[PDB]
Amino acid sequence: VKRFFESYHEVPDGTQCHRKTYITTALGGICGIIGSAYSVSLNPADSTLEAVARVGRYTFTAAAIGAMFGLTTCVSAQVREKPDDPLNYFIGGCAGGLTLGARTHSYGTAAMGCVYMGTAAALFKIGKLEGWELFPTPKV
Amino acid sequence: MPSTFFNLTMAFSLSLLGTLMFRSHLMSTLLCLEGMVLSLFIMTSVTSLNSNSMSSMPIPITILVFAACEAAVGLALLVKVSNTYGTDYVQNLNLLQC
Amino acid sequence: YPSKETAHWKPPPWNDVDILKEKAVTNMTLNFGPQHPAAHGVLRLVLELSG
Amino acid sequence: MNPITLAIIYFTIFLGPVITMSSTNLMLMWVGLEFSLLAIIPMLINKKNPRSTEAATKYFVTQATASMIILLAIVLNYKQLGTWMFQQQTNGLILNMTLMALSMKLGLAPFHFWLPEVTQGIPLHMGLILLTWQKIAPLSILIQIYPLLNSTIILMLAITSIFMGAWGGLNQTQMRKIMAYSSIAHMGWMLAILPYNPSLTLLNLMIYIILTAPMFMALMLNNSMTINSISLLWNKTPAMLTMISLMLLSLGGLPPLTGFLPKWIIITELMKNNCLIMATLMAMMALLNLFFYTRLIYSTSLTMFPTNNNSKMMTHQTKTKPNLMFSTLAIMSTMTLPLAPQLIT
Amino acid sequence: GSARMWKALTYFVALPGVGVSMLNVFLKSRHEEHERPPFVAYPHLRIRTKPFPWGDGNHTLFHNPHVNPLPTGYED
Amino acid sequence: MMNGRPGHEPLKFLPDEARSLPPPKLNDPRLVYMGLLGYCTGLMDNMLRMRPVMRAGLHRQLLFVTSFVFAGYFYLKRQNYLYAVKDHDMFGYIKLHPEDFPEKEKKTYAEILEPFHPVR
Amino acid sequence: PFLDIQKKLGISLDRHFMFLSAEQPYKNAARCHAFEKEWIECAHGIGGTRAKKECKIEFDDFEECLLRYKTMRRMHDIKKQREKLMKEGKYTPPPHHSGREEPRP
Amino acid sequence: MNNYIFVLSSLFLVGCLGLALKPSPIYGGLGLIVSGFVGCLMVLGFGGSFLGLMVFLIYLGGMLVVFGYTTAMATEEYPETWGSNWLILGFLVLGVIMEVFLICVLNYYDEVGVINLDGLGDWLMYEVDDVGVMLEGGIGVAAMYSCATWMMVVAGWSLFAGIFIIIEITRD
Amino acid sequence: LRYGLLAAILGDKTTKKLHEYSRVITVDGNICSGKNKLAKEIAQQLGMKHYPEAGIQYSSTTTGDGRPLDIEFSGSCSLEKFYDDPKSNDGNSYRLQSWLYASRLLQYADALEHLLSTGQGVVLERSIYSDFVFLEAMYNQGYIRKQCVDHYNEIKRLTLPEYLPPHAVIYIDVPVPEVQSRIQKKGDPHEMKVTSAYLQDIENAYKKTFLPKMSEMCEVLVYDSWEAEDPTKVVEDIEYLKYNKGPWLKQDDWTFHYLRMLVQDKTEVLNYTTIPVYLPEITIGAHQGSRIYNSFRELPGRKYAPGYNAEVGDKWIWLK
Ligand SMILES: Nc1nc2c(ncn2[C@H]2C[C@H](O)[C@@H](COP(=O)(O)OP(=O)(O)OP(=O)(O)O)O2)c(=O)[nH]1
Ligand SMILES: [Mg+2]
């Protein structure tokens, strides 16, 4: 999946919007199944039916967040024809936050998701433009 | 030898899976620990006989001693749990959460 | 910070010693005899043993 | 507990980690950890209460699983390289086994779920011995293999350790659980600085130890088990509220306390190795750690909680519990910041 | 309780301590056979401004012919 | 990071090369601050054992001051030795690899053209 | 070791059985005795980083000596090609490899 | 007689698999003794009799103590064996099926990796000194009396301390 | 603290200093029934140390100067006020009861430490095992409330099993009308301001709870007034008792050592009596606590640790 997530960065933004939406949906689904596995292991459900239901709900929610985040990011980039601009990822981050608020059924979580995920996606864009290293090898 | 060593590594992996996936018997958990002990002993011993490391032949006996003393301490702790509750069931050990 | 899944907790005891229900002494009841060489044939020794 | 068993158990407690540091062999470091575990189990089950039995059982199963993952890594290395040393070309899978096992040895997140449980239900002296002495031998093994570790999983383990420790410290009221989550955050700091320089890792370990020992001692003076119990310390022992405030502020890392120095120099070398996002996230979670410290200070020193009647006879009686070592460790944990170049190698 | 404690310290600490120190000196005194240093007539050593009020006036009160040379040399 | 240097004695406090260093002058702000820390430790000890703060335990305060200055002096000697060998190894590496540290020709403000940004 | 009491006093509690060419009972050398002997004396005094780079030749000989990863591939390719020729019938086993040889002491 | 050690190690895996599937601890001890016997025969196959016989005898004694404790307190009214639950037999048969599937995949896809069918048994005994005395595994453990002073003293102190440990734990 | 692990290993064995007359004998009875003279004469003709009933000012008399301190230092609870108005709205009754229980706990720690250190037995008056009688008498008479009863029971559960029960419990059976007649005869008007319902509650709590619990773990010596009132037959029976039950049989040197450490450290004796359970009868508050504590600190001989107060004649402060 490393080649896959590297192939996300093969094309500049605003191009292959379907591919970007698909790969970000897949990454959101991976994050969702990890979080749902942690939830069902730390807090066990009363039966396996509602346990796997909770896994499905968390996976669908995280996949929806990733899907609309990547989709809105790509469409905003190609509507503004400005590929390397962090405001497109900020708009995508608020789209993800509004999906989180819609799934949680609370506008407060929607607004908090907008601001936090927009900041996170914007700083992710700045990192991937200006060469920030998240987990650097020790050099000194 | 590589097939046997891989198979012993998967034996350790299965015993670790058993240890990490609890059942209502702490005794069965300790038995899974002893299965891990077996797998570690056999891999160390077969590596010693493969490499003819006559100076590293003490290593299986040392891990034998230390892991069986682990077993003795765990058995004493299980006796304490049974004196407390009447059963060795691991879901009776859940009131330190508060 | 009491929530629904954690409001049932009680504070820990001050001396860390919990009050537990006194468990029933699971003592084995054995019918020593009457068909027993040491019971002389017709003794039903109901024997209430621990070990 | 007779002097014979006291001497045997205390000498084995001392001997385990010293064997681990002094010994070259992975086998001997493993058996030193093994010595430490067997030696410290009976003192956890010393009080013979059900909570002590729970703590001993959880601690034993966690430590045994970690020891056997360590042993798996050692035997797999010895198969791969024929030696008893992670020298230079040992497998990254083996090293990740070692790191996971040593993290669950230590009690940092996401392997942190047992440490508040174990430190709860045990007496305060053994919580102190655990949260100070038991975390040197895994640090000895980790410092032994600093350049070979995977910085990605190191940094991820560290940042989730600080996040979970800060959140748990905010939530909990029991002093032992508060100390456990503080421990988890501090081990996150040491684990993050571990691949870049183990010297600052040892500096942060010593600063954490010399801060944690006298705060635990102040907990020992009245067996102040809860926030309310440390809150009526103004009627119990009023001459120590200032040092309580200063020690908790140094644990929070406010300048000009010397507990700011490990966080500051760790962040400095993190920027020297260009992980600014990592250091920023760690520093804000350290601020959250400082938040629950400040709430504890608000409860115990700056406000004066209501006292009860029998504290009058508490004032009537006299106490000689605070030992000679408390003040020296408190002063070195409070006013040492101008000696920062001497503390840093 | 004080008198018992002091009795125990004397028998189990002080007497073994004197035994170990005596054994140390006794083993050293059997291995060391000191090479008498060569005589050097240093002007600040063996000063005699007035004879001693005993013997010949030239031997010290605790004179030892083997280790203590006169202003002129060793006696042998 | 300097424990692997050649000629490093194992578990040695102050080697003979450290004796080539100038000792601390024994009246310096570091040792004076360590003695003041010892005095504060003695005062804290008196207050915590509920005695007069400075009228009680004069021998205890004296021992605290003496022990603090002793530890501070020897630790200071060790740290000056460590910083001396750090700078010595740094300069030795500089002279050992001169092509990796070229002497840059810094050029004056008559041919460097810095941009001007007017504040208006 | 994290602390060097072992090097300070000169005692050897465990340093004499770190590896294969260390102290062996009754002079029974371990497998790959010379090969990792060359690896140690190549890597001694140059540090861990230099050991991985300019002693790659000595390590690769020892790593393949102990594990025999390349040698198993050579012997399998001998056997896989051999039975491939026997199915087509364009090869015959010799008498000495099929069990009828002239033995020698 | 080339796949003898391989079928032995497969028996060891299925014994450890039953132990992981965790029946009642009496049957767990049964599986642990048969797996220890298999490990004894495996160490015998790869070489010296000493280590295999010692681990075999030690786990005779150890699970003797263990079975005594299962009869003591680790018991219930109706013990669960492997065949007590459909789930346990289900994971047992999927474990056997997955073992067969994994060895077939390692035979086919990766060719000469950890498992090779054509090369099975050819790499069992690597090098043995054909002419020579004192080559058995017990001589090294005997030299641990002389060459391994530190190992002897830490093992003896571990058992001594552990006697004290169990006394204070079960002091009650 | 000279006693410790070093003193124990150098030889301070309580079983070595133990002998035949080293018993804890607690004399108990109703509110006025021959209790003080019986205990002191038993101690006098057995060579034992007599501990009278732990009053409100027990800690004041045993700590520092030994003079009875002022009331808000010694608990701000009045037995006379309890007698005058037992149902007062301030909460005097349970405050007095908890103070008396904690003073009895301090006296029990003192008696246990004296027995374990010197070997001389102790004759207590109305030890901690018979103060829940006054708890239940106040509760059944409606003087206190269920929260106070629960708080007392929690303190008793925290503190009681850490000590050893007395070797002998002597009881004095005197009926309620005779108790009332003796109360009338004594002449304290607050003491005559008691109720026969309260006295019957005390005797009922005795007969229904106190005697069986000590019956299953020590020697019970119920005596009536004329079997009492002449303290020689009780002494003869104490001499010819056989102590073959209770936890005293299984005690050894190190258990005695740890019990001695616990009873000589008074902080862990009175630690669990000061639990921060915020009951309005017991809790005080920051301002009143500060004023009372500062007045206690400016009391003579109480500003510093004992031996360090220069105003009472302590010497060589600068060298200690
Ligand atoms: N309410 C209450 N009063 C108590 C308690 N303990 C003692 N008192 C009171 C009862 C008496 O008025 C007073 C003295 O107690 P005694 O029983 O010793 O009475 P007194 O000495 O007058 O008679 P005596 O000859 O000793 O029986 O203390 C207690 O726990 N609660
Ligand atoms: Mg009386």
Automatic annotation (TrEMBL), chain A:
One of its GO terms (cellular component) is respiratory chain complex I. It comes from the Eukaryota. Disulfide bonds join C17-C74, C94-C114. It is a multi-pass membrane protein. GO terms for biological process: mitochondrial electron transport, NADH to ubiquinone. It holds the Pfam family Tim17. It is found in: Mitochondrion inner membrane. Keywords: Membrane, Mitochondrion, Mitochondrion inner membrane, Transmembrane, Transmembrane helix. Signal peptide: none annotated. Complex I is composed of 45 different subunits. Belongs to the complex I NDUFA11 subunit family. Accessory subunit of the mitochondrial membrane respiratory chain NADH dehydrogenase (Complex I), that is believed not to be involved in catalysis. Complex I functions in the transfer of electrons from NADH to the respiratory chain. The immediate electron acceptor for the enzyme is believed to be ubiquinone. This is NADH dehydrogenase [ubiquinone] 1 alpha subcomplex subunit 11. It comes from Mus musculus (Mouse). The lineage of its organism: Eukaryota, Metazoa, Chordata, Craniata, Vertebrata.
